[PDB]
Amino acid sequence: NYPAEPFRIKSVETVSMIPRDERLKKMQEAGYNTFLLNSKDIYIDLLTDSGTNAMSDKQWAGMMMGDEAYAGSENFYHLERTVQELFGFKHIVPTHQGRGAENLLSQLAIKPGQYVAGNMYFTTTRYHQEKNGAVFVDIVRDEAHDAGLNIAFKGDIDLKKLQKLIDEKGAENIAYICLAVTVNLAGGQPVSMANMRAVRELTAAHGIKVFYDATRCVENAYFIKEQEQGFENKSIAEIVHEMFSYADGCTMSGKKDCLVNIGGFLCMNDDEMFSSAKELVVVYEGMPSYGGLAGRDMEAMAIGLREAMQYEYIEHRVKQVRYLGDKLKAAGVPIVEPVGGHAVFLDARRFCEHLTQDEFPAQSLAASIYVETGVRSMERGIISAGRNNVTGEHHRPKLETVRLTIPRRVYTYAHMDVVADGIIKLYQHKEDIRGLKFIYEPKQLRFFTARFDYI
Amino acid sequence: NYPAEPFRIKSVETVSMIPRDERLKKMQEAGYNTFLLNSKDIYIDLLTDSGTNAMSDKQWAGMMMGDEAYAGSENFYHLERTVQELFGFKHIVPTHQGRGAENLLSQLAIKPGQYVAGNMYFTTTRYHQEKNGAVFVDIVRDEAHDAGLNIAFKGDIDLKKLQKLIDEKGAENIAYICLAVTVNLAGGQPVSMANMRAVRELTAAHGIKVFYDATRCVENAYFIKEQEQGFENKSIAEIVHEMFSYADGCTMSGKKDCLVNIGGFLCMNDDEMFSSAKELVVVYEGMPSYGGLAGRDMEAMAIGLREAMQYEYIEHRVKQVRYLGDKLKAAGVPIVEPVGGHAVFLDARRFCEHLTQDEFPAQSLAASIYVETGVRSMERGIISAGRNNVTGEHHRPKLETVRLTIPRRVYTYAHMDVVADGIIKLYQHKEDIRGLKFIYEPKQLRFFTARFDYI
Amino acid sequence: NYPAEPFRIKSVETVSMIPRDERLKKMQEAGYNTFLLNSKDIYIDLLTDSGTNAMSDKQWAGMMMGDEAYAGSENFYHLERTVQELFGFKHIVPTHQGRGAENLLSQLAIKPGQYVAGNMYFTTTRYHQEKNGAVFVDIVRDEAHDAGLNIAFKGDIDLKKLQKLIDEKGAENIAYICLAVTVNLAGGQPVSMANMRAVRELTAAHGIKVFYDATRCVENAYFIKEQEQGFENKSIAEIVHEMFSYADGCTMSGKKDCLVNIGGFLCMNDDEMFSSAKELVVVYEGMPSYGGLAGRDMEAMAIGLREAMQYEYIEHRVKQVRYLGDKLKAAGVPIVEPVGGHAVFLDARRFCEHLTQDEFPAQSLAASIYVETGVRSMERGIISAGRNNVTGEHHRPKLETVRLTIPRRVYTYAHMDVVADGIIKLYQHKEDIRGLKFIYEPKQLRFFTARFDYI
Amino acid sequence: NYPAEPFRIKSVETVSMIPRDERLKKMQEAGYNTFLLNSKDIYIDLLTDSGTNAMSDKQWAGMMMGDEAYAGSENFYHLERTVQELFGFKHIVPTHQGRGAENLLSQLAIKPGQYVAGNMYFTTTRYHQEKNGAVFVDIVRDEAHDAGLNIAFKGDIDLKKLQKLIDEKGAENIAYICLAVTVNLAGGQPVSMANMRAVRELTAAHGIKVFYDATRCVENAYFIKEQEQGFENKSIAEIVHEMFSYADGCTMSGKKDCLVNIGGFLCMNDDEMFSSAKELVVVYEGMPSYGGLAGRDMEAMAIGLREAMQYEYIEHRVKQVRYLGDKLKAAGVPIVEPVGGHAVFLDARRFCEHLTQDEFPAQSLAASIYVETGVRSMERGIISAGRNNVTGEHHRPKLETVRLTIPRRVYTYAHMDVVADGIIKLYQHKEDIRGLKFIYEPKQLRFFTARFDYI
Ligand SMILES: C=C(/N=C/c1c(COP(=O)(O)O)cnc(C)c1O)C(=O)O
Ligand SMILES: C=C(/N=C/c1c(COP(=O)(O)O)cnc(C)c1O)C(=O)O
Ligand SMILES: [K+]
Ligand SMILES: [K+]
Ligand SMILES: [K+]
Ligand SMILES: [K+]
């Protein structure tokens, strides 16, 4: 069952419906790298769900009431009250987006040489942990690393790995546990409430802090409501509030589940850390009462976080992604399983099994998808993994995928059909997909500006 | 086929359904007339495509650049030259919506006792004709009155009827021919270019003026491109411009095909009529330089009329209506055929064969649709047709219909499925729909605020 | 004493600061008629205070929450509740602006041959009265016709003239009393509460209806608060509510004192007339619940009417106009006295006493003002009076004036200084102002498109 | 002279004053630091010109056309090419505001132990220099530190000081010269083109890089046009482009002279530095294609930087500040002279000659201004100067000032008169202002959230 949109369209965004012949020329001008395409040339842009969301009429009304004062803006107090109400943390510091909050948390909470342990990781999060002297330890359950395994709550932390870390390194040498909801690297997999409570129980017995990476915590809450026994009578807001009751604080990218185009924040319960955070936020972001955001954006993020709590909104959000995954899977197209809250990942290793990884199957599949449909997707394979600059060899990741990342409230099921129909047609003659070779490769950030040609 | 939306969602508004018990209360508080229900108590609002459209990001950018000057506004010049370019008429007078332009035309072009002949009546149009002393004569082809007959270009004028009128009444006693594109009350049926050309040739030979009702001219142009031999490779804009080349002027409700929420205009080629129209507009609407519109709305209408010329936009507009009609017809639900440009008309005579037309089956069917579905639709039958101003008896249209009217760019195919599924279920117990009788009847245009009770 | 603006600027409107040499070319291209100037070529546009107001951030937030439903829009209920609260009338029908409401009132309230009596008149108001068969009778106090007489509440009705009318024509032959607040034709002069109560007392004794032309009723309320004994402790809202307690209904142009760019409405207390108005509004304007306005505009007008009740806003509005009049008067420039709520009128007969009225001194002064300052003003003299088309002679009005009409919240005191300094400099060599002659004169609406050259 | 605003008001926001008793309570709740007051409790907010500007109708139209794509946004391309055209640098990296660009520059261009030399310190700039291991050296002319000395181009670097630094330290130990235009903490003082050219010539001869702080470069260009011989007939844009031709790159807070509420960027000519900057921006800000900004804000900043080039806009901006300074100086109030581009600085040393600088007269004067006036102003003296990171003692600036900072396009001359009248009255009892002592001092950038009590 797939629900209708629980909203209607207030205003539309103009697009170029250029045809296949012209899309091929645009793809070649981009050197077959979807990251180099111009937005104006893309029909359906599934590069990312970050910051690409459609706002409501209520949020746009809030955008006309930005109090742009440098200190003490009414919009900050609205955001503060909303986050305290819905997440339940004592203190909040706005940041311009998620990695701004990560920067502050890692400087406040890590002594060099300490460990940070988490359920897999995200690139910016782990960078700020490592930059401040932490050693990262993955404590996710082993199943999360099996991309074909169709089981619930795949993002759960293995409590035995956490106990083992505590026993081998000592609780005083662990800076914090970093629990992400959902788990992006596993394909957007949720964490169960039972897991969050067990982690809080164990860490609290040792005086260890837990901070959440909360960027898709509402998608996570929907999975708990749908699949965890005992939560069928709880509202999304009740589930969200209980989730954060098991944490000492969080970092949040509003660009994901708060339904905005920019914005984030840092939450914590400890007064002393809050005071230290306010001393640091002015260094990198702005005042404790704007944190690198215009007043109107704090307002839109306060309104959007509250909208995200509507059951029908988040049900439809997750089930629209599920629709895309279900349609591909029914045609035999290989995807990461189960489908996550925000994206479908194509398995390009299996999709293009006639290509070796050195011929960049995911990069080439993403280029084919755009030519055939006008859909942009993100390479998440060997190109994004980068090259080892000491040895000169590619980093070879186990996952060679194309990410179909779904912005919130932007597309319809008919757009999902454009994406799926086009991929299914490609799959039916997948052996015709050609390998790629570099014609320009920069030393760093190579996925952003590299250019290719066909082998 | 059924194309996906050729645009993305930029902003949303929430929709919601109140329980059946509450809709029942609301419906009897509205005296079983859908016009009297409150917007907040509707779920999917298909009352009308008039003024309910979603604007684009470009139109909303135009809304921030309203030049609100009383005379000489940049927005007026933009609207004036956009209409001169796309429609080809010499002169434009803005009005706040279509019936303001009809008020002006009828006062300018009718001498009491004269005939106005058109391809089927419309409610406000016919009121202003008769109010100024004209007798209305219907010269549409007989087939347009047969709901079930699936033939192309049902809106066409019967040239034999036009010829007969000229012979029996004399050309000097005909004030003008009123040619509407599409024809709303026939079900949104298009008029062919061959018919517009034949009508021009016959009227010109007798010195008789032709004024178009331009309200859904872009939907009409799409049907010409899709189905009239020789037009398959003409652009929508080319077809629109050729259409109006066979007219002396037009009235336009921009609230339909100009993709806005308010706005209209009167066009003409004749200099003396334009001079007279400017004297009159001051009394009813405003100065000729804004015609009862804010500058920002002249701007949005100039932008939206040009957007409407995009083939993919109007193809999707029309085929989304066709999807709803196709799904209802596949389930056996009786509808007006072929499906028109803007709405699906349920054939209330067949839905409610247990009722005579004096029991108002269309009015009653609309009420029952809201009660069982939360979807609002409009009566288009004996209630809307009014009374004969000579005998005092009902006008008795063969077409007794309930209109599922689709606003432009607002809903998705999933919303269409919700509508179709609900109507198909009500079809299964159609015998439960009771007849209605008047408890309050306005003296004109009675359908707007009439109140009914069950017989 | 002149207060600072009780607001700050949220956003600005871009203007062309073209210099004098270029302004002279624009004036010549406009044939020396300020009505023909392009808005884009004007620095400070004082043509009118109608519909040219600046909205607040709160109103623009309301503009993002337009409920564009054809019937039952939430914005209509907001407007309805606001007008019932602030004006106290039982029923309200929205219209697209003031003359839409006048059209409806005059058709509902006049039997042919009846009299309508008022404190002077406005052009559209009297047209709709006369078009429906009324004979207009001026019952303003004699002093209002003395444009140099500096006395308070110059708009007051002479109760003896009203008694005389009742005695000579009979109360059953008077359709209604039309009491305007303020009185535009006298230069924007207020009416006292004592006068409103006396008129209500007298008319009620005879069963005669009173309807207000309420377009600048808030400016009027400020004069009562400032100058009528006993109202120093009353709020603007209290004064406004008491004013309308002496009326049976009103017509309102929101384009003036409701601080919007479009919109108006009709109010009445009588159920039967309300029911008749709802039958008529659909003919000319729209549904009783939108009346020719987009939902967003009903919202902005509801918000703006409530903002207009703020004492500091309306005090500053009236005193900014007063500042301009005081500065001109201190330099000896001849103006209509006292200065009204919305405009300063220059006496061009005295300003250009070396020119005869057939040389159009007001039209020429308005052209000079634009060339010297970039300020557009309105001719209100012999050109606007029109030509008698039977005899071919000008209508020769006693008042030959240039109107400096001040939009609400758009300009600063520094703009008022630009206007005043430029006029004062012109006055110091007023004998150099040249007379004008027609080079193009249309048969009607001649002030709108006539063109001139220097004698 | 004092020109009128070269724009009209398009939209407003209300302002209000709470009673003195309430401001007194608010001020001690803020611990006598103006940074801790709440926006709703301020009347006229002169805390800062940073991010408080009023945008234009064109910018707000741009805000409706935000292309929120993660890469390839039309808004990024517009900002990129606008900056390349107006500033002339080869490469641009957007950041969410200026201190994000300072974070990147300081990490890219400083090796620990090296010197950075600039024309007076700024708070966030100096923090990021020192945090990355640089020693700051002030090479502004001695006169810039003398509040009362009225000389032109007080921001100029002393070339003898620059030469001395090169001789004593060696050019290889200087990371770069930081040249700010205007110089904020000297009172908004401009730098001459002759000085920028001399600095470029001397640094280039030694291979030393020059990076500008571009934050108020348009105000600086205005002073050059107004006062530097030979530039009187150059356009603001020409002057701006020549200015940056003497630099290797710049940091920019668009929140000042780009007329926006959020936004900044880093420019450079060097290709390898640009490559490194793109790696770093990902960690702190976002992808190089949006740099921590929504698309709509890249758009507003591209539009606003071009608007700032309009001569009449920036002339009025600067002369409105000058008006406030002239009115205070005419009444004997001690100020920094000449008045700078963005603010009037009261000379707190002279206002409060009864206090030593260790009693924080500037911090105390700011509090008393809010208590007596409701006007918020900022401390710019010993509190902002921070502590010496080697000795732990106060930095002791000669300039102990209270800043009346003017947001662009927000206030009128009448608002300036309210401010001046209030300060002139407080001047009459200056002996009533008590000294302050710290009760809470942050470890860096302490002025933002420090809390004080009276001695
Ligand atoms: C309101 C509707 N139509 C308006 C209309 C009008 C009157 O336009 P305004 O509603 O803008 O006055 C004129 N001609 C045709 C063919 C129309 O359909 C409707 O069908 O719902
Ligand atoms: C916030 C202020 N200034 C910021 C600033 C900055 C830092 O910019 P952001 O506030 O955008 O980070 C850098 N350079 C100069 C000369 C500045 O004035 C202020 O003066 O109020
Ligand atoms: K974004
Ligand atoms: K701001
Ligand atoms: K207007
Ligand atoms: K509407």
Q: Which two tokens stand for residue A443?
A: 């030393």
Q: How far apart are CA C387 and CA C398, in angstroms?
A: 15
User: Cα–Cα distances in Å, from B30 out to A29, B233, B367?
Assistant: 60, 49, 10
User: Is the backbone peptide bond immediately before D182 cis, with ω within 30 degrees of 0?
Assistant: yes
Q: Which two tokens stand for residue C130?
A: 């006369």
Alpha-carbon torsion (D172, D174, D175, D176), positive or negative: negative
Q: Which two tokens stand for residue A342?
A: 């925000």
Give the closest residue to C258 by CA, choosing from C412, C423, C35, C56. C56
Cβ neighbours, 10 Å, residue A145: 15
Whether C412 and D12 lie within 8 Å, measured CB to CB = no
| One-letter amino acid of C323 | Y
| CATH architecture of the domain with range A1-56+310-454 | Alpha-Beta Complex (3.90)
Q: Assign C357 to helix, strand or coil.
A: helix
Q: Which two tokens stand for residue D91?
A: 């490469």
Q: Which two tokens stand for residue B345?
A: 């008309």
Q: Determine the distance separating the centroid of ligand 1 and the alpha carbon of B198, expressed in angstroms.
A: 26
Q: Is C391 exposed, middle or buried (0-12, 13-18, 19+ CB in 10 A)?
A: exposed
Do strands B55-56 and B249-253 pair parallel, antiparallel, or not at all (unpaired)?
unpaired
Whether C40 and B67 lie within 8 Å, measured CB to CB = yes
Of C12, C59, C310, the CB nearest to D9: C12
Give the closest residue to A6 by CA, choosing from C349, B245, B412. B412
CA neighbours closer than 13 Å in the CB half-sphere of residue A13: 24
Q: Which ligand is nearest to the CA of C73?
A: 6
Give the closest residue to B63 by CA, choosing from D307, C257, C261. C261
Whether B4 and A56 lie within 8 Å, measured CB to CB = no
Q: Which residue has the tokens 């000042």?
A: D256
Helices C193-206 and C159-169 cross at an angle (nearest 10°) of 20
Q: Determine the distance separating the centroid of ligand 6 and the alpha carbon of B441, expressed in angstroms.
A: 25
Substitution candidate for ligand 1 out of B52, B122, B125, B262 with most atoms within 8 A of CB: B122
Give the closest residue to C51 by CA, choosing from B264, D5, B290. B290
Burial annotation B371-396 (CB, 10 A radius, 16+ → b, else e): bbbbbbbbbbbbbbbbeeeeeeeeee
Nearest CA to ligand 1 atom 2: B50
| One-letter amino acid of C24 | L
Q: Which two tokens stand for residue B441?
A: 């009847």
Nearest CA to ligand 1 atom 13: B98
Query: In this complex, is the C-beta atom of D330 within 8 Å of any C-beta atom belonging to chain C?
Result: no
User: Cα–Cα distances in Å, from B92 out to A133, B288, B290?
Assistant: 72, 9, 11
Task: Please say whether the beta carbons of B418 and A4 come within 8 A.
Answer: yes
Whether D64 and B60 lie within 8 Å, measured CB to CB = yes
Q: Which residue has the tokens 């012109």?
A: C426
Q: Assign A346 to helix, strand or coil.
A: strand
Q: How far apart are CA A54 and CA C64, in angstroms?
A: 14
Q: How far apart are CA A256 and CA A266, in angstroms?
A: 15
Q: How far apart are CA A145 and CA B139, in angstroms?
A: 74
For ligand 2, whether the C-beta of D184 sits within 6 Å is yes
CA neighbours closer than 13 Å in the CB half-sphere of residue C398: 8
User: Cα–Cα distances in Å, from A164 out to A112, A135, A138, A202, A210?
Assistant: 21, 15, 12, 12, 17
Alpha-carbon torsion (C116, C122, C127, C132), positive or negative: negative
Segment holding B153, helix H or strand E: none
Segment holding C338, helix H or strand E: none
Identify the chains in contact with B, defined as 3+ C-beta pairs within 8 A.
Answer: A, C, D
Do strands A7-13 and B55-56 pair parallel, antiparallel, or not at all (unpaired)?
parallel
| One-letter amino acid of A438 | F
Q: DSSP of D156-184, one letter per residue?
A: -B-HHHHHHHHHHH-GGGEEEEEEESSBG
Task: Please say whether the beta carbons of A176 and A214 come within 8 A.
Answer: no
Q: How far apart are CA A116 and CA A136, in angstroms?
A: 5
User: Is the backbone peptide bond immediately before C182 cis, with ω within 30 degrees of 0?
Assistant: yes
For ligand 1, whether the C-beta of B180 sits within 6 Å is yes
Nearest CA in chain A to D280: A445
Query: In this complex, is the C-beta atom of B292 within 8 Å of any C-beta atom belonging to chain C?
Result: yes
Query: In this complex, is the C-beta atom of B449 within 8 Å of any C-beta atom belonging to chain A?
Result: no
Q: DSSP of A250-269, one letter per residue?
A: EEEETTTTT--SS-EEEEES
Give the closest residue to D368 by CA, choosing from D28, D119, D6. D28
Q: How far apart are CA B402 and CA B381, in angstroms?
A: 8
Q: Provide the Cα torsion B311, B314, B318, B319; round to 10°.
A: 50
User: Cα–Cα distances in Å, from D155 out to D158, D196, D197?
Assistant: 9, 11, 14
Whether A279 and D449 lie within 8 Å, measured CB to CB = yes
Please compute Rg for chain A using Cα positions: 22
User: Terminus-to-terminus CA distance in chain D, angstroms?
Assistant: 45
Substitution candidate for ligand 1 out of B104, B253, B285 with most atoms within 8 A of CB: B253
Please compute Rg for chain D using Cα positions: 21
Q: Determine the distance separating the centroid of ligand 5 and the alpha carbon of D275, expressed in angstroms.
A: 51
Chain B residues with CB-CB distance to D296 below 8 A? none
Helices C271-284 and B123-131 cross at an angle (nearest 10°) of 100
Q: How far apart are CA A312 and CA A314, in angstroms?
A: 6
Q: CATH code for A57-309?
A: 3.40.640.10
Give the closest residue to C301 by CA, choosing from C9, C73, C12. C73
Residue B301 phi, psi dihedral angles, 5° rounding: -75, -35
Q: How far apart are CA A197 and CA A213, in angstroms?
A: 16
What residues of D act catalytically? 70, 122-123, 213, 256, 380, 447
Q: Assign C252 to helix, strand or coil.
A: strand
Residue boundaries of the structural domains of chain A: 1-56+310-454, 57-309
Task: Please say whether the beta carbons of A284 and D284 come within 8 A.
Answer: yes
Do strands B436-440 and B451-454 pair parallel, antiparallel, or not at all (unpaired)?
antiparallel
Residue C246 phi, psi dihedral angles, 5° rounding: -100, 10
Q: Which ligand is nearest to the CA of B286?
A: 5
Query: In this complex, is the C-beta atom of D46 within 8 Å of any C-beta atom belonging to chain C?
Result: no
Q: How far apart are CA A383 and CA C411, in angstroms?
A: 58
Q: Which two tokens stand for residue D285?
A: 């800000």
Q: Which two tokens stand for residue D47?
A: 């805390």
Burial annotation D407-420 (CB, 10 A radius, 16+ → b, else e): bbbbbbbbbbbbbb
* Residues shown for chain A: 455
Q: How far is C445 from chain D (nearest CA, A)?
A: 30
Query: In this complex, is the C-beta atom of B64 within 8 Å of any C-beta atom belonging to chain A?
Result: no
Q: Determine the distance separating the centroid of ligand 2 and the alpha carbon of D261, expressed in angstroms.
A: 13
User: Is the backbone peptide bond immediately before B19 cis, with ω within 30 degrees of 0?
Assistant: no
User: Cα–Cα distances in Å, from C444 out to A44, B276, C185, C389, D19?
Assistant: 55, 9, 21, 9, 58
Alpha-carbon torsion (D267, D272, D278, D284), positive or negative: negative
Residue D229 phi, psi dihedral angles, 5° rounding: -55, 135
For ligand 1, whether the C-beta of B45 sits within 6 Å is no
For ligand 1, whether the C-beta of B34 sits within 6 Å is no
Q: Which residue has the tokens 């945090």?
A: D131
Q: Which two tokens stand for residue A175?
A: 């800076």
Resolution in A: 1.8
Q: How far is A164 from chain B (nearest CA, A)?
A: 49
Q: Classify residue C245 as left (phi > 0), alpha (psi -120 to 50) or beta.
A: alpha
Q: Assign A119 to helix, strand or coil.
A: coil
* DSSP-H helix ranges across C285-360: 295-308, 311-330, 348-351
Query: In this complex, is the C-beta atom of C441 within 8 Å of any C-beta atom belonging to chain B?
Result: no
Do the two domains B1-56+310-454 and B57-309 of this chain adopt the same fold? no
The CA angle D411-D364-D119, to the nearest 5 degrees, is 70
User: Is the backbone peptide bond immediately before C397 cis, with ω within 30 degrees of 0?
Assistant: no
Q: Assign D55 to helix, strand or coil.
A: strand
Q: Which two tokens stand for residue A273?
A: 């850390």
Chain B residues with CB-CB distance to C47 below 8 A? 69-71
Nearest CA in chain D to A44: D69
Q: How far apart are CA B302 and CA B259, in angstroms?
A: 10
Q: How far apart are CA C182 and CA C339, in angstroms?
A: 12
The CA angle B13-B19-B20, to the nearest 5 degrees, is 125
Ion ligand 6: residues, CB within 5 A, are: B 51, 261; C 68, 294
